Design a protein around this ligand. Structure first.
Ligand SMILES: CCCc1cc(=O)n2nc(NCc3c(F)cc(Cl)cc3F)c(C#N)c2[nH]1
Ligand SMILES: CCCc1cc(=O)n2nc(NCc3c(F)cc(Cl)cc3F)c(C#N)c2[nH]1
Ligand SMILES: *Cc1c(COP(=O)(O)O)cnc(C)c1O
Ligand SMILES: *Cc1c(COP(=O)(O)O)cnc(C)c1O
Ligand SMILES: [Mg+2]
Lengths: 365, 366
């Protein structure tokens, strides 16, 4: 039981460097930088020294448990080139906390969160010219942790690989504006269950999503609204946390989001939005159950203001419609500004690009 | 695009150095691999490439491959058996091809021609046929595997995939080669699968989530997990195996019971074979029915339980001796009852697998 250390980094620079992309023509998660971080683990010898080396294919035994039994987890965070040309990470300690917690739940080996964050800092530093020269683009950082056990028994792995990829990305939507989405709400598909891994960023949570999203697209919708339970609770939207801004049953202005009862991924963006809403103290902030009946009752009383997803790749993604029980239900998000969604995006973007000082950002090592 | 690969297009790159075969008595499940593997690449742009049989070697995967990030992956498990007549047989391999195809559609992995995949698997086993053990208690495990190799990090249907097949010689699941009854850990805190989920498919995402509960079982002195579901603590599966209960039921009737295929149970090939045999014998009631922990503890207090066992490909029939539940150890008298039915099932399935009797369930290697 132990950790790799950043002071042990072995750095092998690429001798052929790739052209950087146009920061205005960027598709999320498609372009990769020159270098990656890799760290090997075995039960026999523990953590090997960490390597920063050229981006390359992984060489994996075909029996590797990541390939058979989804022994795998990941993270997602961003580096931003500030208005002052200082590169900043955003809330990276929250990602290290979540990745450590996911590793325990996956039965992958633990590591020192500060050692991994310093290894990520050194990788971004080497590839810093990849952090785009744009106030609407960023560098996506993908820490990934896989079982590489070369045996077909279903068991805790005795071999693993932790690696980090970098990808320059633009706005999630090419327009760089709000592209409000239609949601497909079919209770036939359930993303997560009590006693499952839905509250960890484990790869096994995401395999089911593709089929339901393909069905959404066949029915003229862009994303899945994940429903849970006999009362059709609204939980998450695609790969994003779900917020509802409304007048509640008590006549109170409220920002509501489902609570962390085991079927909700505790998003870093979700945490930030709840912290902002509590700080502003302008309306009620509630982690509470929201059902489709709660929503349709509110819509018929003109009580709904905004619905939006939260997540790293999109930040704030408004919802305009839900298809449920054969009816298209309009959500008036875009007819209400969307004032709160816009205020949140502006605040987070100002912090990310260093337009205001914050404890939420760390300058590049 | 090429809609499916064909076996007639197989490219064979033989290994030039062959490995020493293992002792068929000293085999740990899924640890030893044969000389060759099958690989077939797919892209949305061009469809399926030609299939390759080549030496076992590492895969070269883009680190963004969706199998590694979002568990875009599934597998199968089936066996080849060297008969008492030295003919190698497969056991209902078309059921595995059907299950794998159905899982691929649910995963959004590309379709393939099930007959062409089975012919490629036959050619791979034929090349590595000396790996099929010279033992009536050992077999060759076949692991078809299908992974998303999409390099991009969006959560989306893959535009690149790899279908591959590994072979692994395996002995009895336990080195003793006799029944090693297990103790089960029953904790309703963890759930394997749920209604609206993918528990009825061999998708890798069903297994990664299970390891934590298995580790908790082991540190509480148990070998396997009894998977509970719902407010009434339905008993569903035992480890990675289907669950059978042989008992006198609530109505006083001798009964072999197993949970029903309601979407949270893997539809095991061994499970369906056991139900088919039990219906054919007609010596007791055969029921696909819900079973709860209360049903089981009530039966045990009434001395109504005869045998409990798992069914699956790697073990065939795996008896259960004990369950740890609500802080108490509950003895299951499987081994004090022979176990007569478990032994009879094992003997019948092994007689079919090793060609001691003719069966529509076996196919001789082409
Ligand atoms: C898994 C981590 C990487 C990642 C991959 C991926 O494919 N997506 N897609 C995202 N947004 C699509 C989307 C939308 F555009 C709108 C709504 Cl309401 C809901 C929604 F999910 C986001 C985000 N944020 C994201 N992140
Ligand atoms: C996933 C497919 C490959 C595979 C991997 C693996 O680790 N196992 N372990 C198995 N048997 C352990 C076990 C037991 F020994 C006894 C009982 Cl009651 C329940 C049980 F699961 C079996 C079987 N059959 C199996 N198959
Ligand atoms: C990552 C993730 C979230 C939250 O994303 P953040 O980028 O941490 O805000 C929500 N739901 C799912 C399924 C996720 O994978
Ligand atoms: C593979 C598997 C079984 C057994 O299926 P067979 O086709 O008999 O090998 C049972 N339960 C689970 C969860 C499985 O993965
Ligand atoms: Mg054909």
């Amino acid at each position: 039981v132990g950790t790799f250390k950043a002071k042990d980094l072995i750095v092998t620079p690429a001798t052929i460097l790739k052209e950087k992309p146009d920061p205005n023509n960027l598709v999320f998660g498609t372009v990769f930088t020159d270098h990656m971080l890799t760290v090997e683990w075995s039960s026999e010898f523990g953590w090997e020294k960490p390597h920063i080396k050229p981006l390359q294919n992984l060489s994996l035994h075909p029996g590797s448990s990541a390939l058979h039994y989804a022994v795998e987890l990941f993270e997602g965070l961003k580096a931003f080139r500030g208005v002052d040309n200082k590169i900043r990470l955003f809330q990276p300690n929250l990602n290290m906390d979540r990745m450590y917690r996911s590793a325990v739940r996956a039965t992958l080996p633990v590591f020192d969160k500060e050692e991994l964050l310093e290894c990520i800092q050194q990788l971004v530093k080497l590839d810093q010219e990849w952090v785009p020269y744009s106030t609407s683009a960023s560098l996506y950082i993908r820490p990934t942790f896989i079982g590489t056990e070369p045996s077909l028994g279903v068991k805790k792995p005795t071999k693993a690989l932790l690696f980090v990829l970098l990808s320059p990305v633009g706005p999630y939507f090419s327009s760089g504006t709000f592209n409000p989405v239609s949601l497909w709400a079919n209770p036939k598909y359930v993303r997560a269950w009590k006693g499952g891994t839905g509250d960890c960023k484990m790869g096994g949570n995401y395999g089911s999503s593709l089929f339901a999203q393909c069905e959404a697209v066949d029915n003229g919708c862009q994303q899945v609204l994940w429903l849970y339970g006999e009362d059709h609770q609204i939980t998450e939207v695609g790969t994003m946390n779900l917020f509802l801004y409304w007048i509640n049953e008590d006549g109170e202005e409220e920002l509501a989001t489902p609570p962390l009862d085991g079927i909700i991924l505790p998003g870093v963006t979700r945490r930030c939005i709840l912290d902002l809403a509590h700080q502003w103290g302008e309306f009620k902030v509630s982690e509470r159950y929201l059902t489709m009946d709660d929503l349709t009752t509110a819509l018929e009383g003109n009580r709904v203001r905004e619905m939006f997803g939260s997540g790293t790749a999109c930040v704030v993604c408004p919802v305009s419609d839900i298809l449920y029980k054969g009816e298209t239900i309009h959500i008036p998000t875009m007819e209400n500004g969307p004032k709160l969604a816009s205020r949140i995006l502006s605040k987070l973007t100002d912090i990310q690009y260093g337009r205001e000082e914050r404890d939420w950002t760390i300058v590049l090592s």
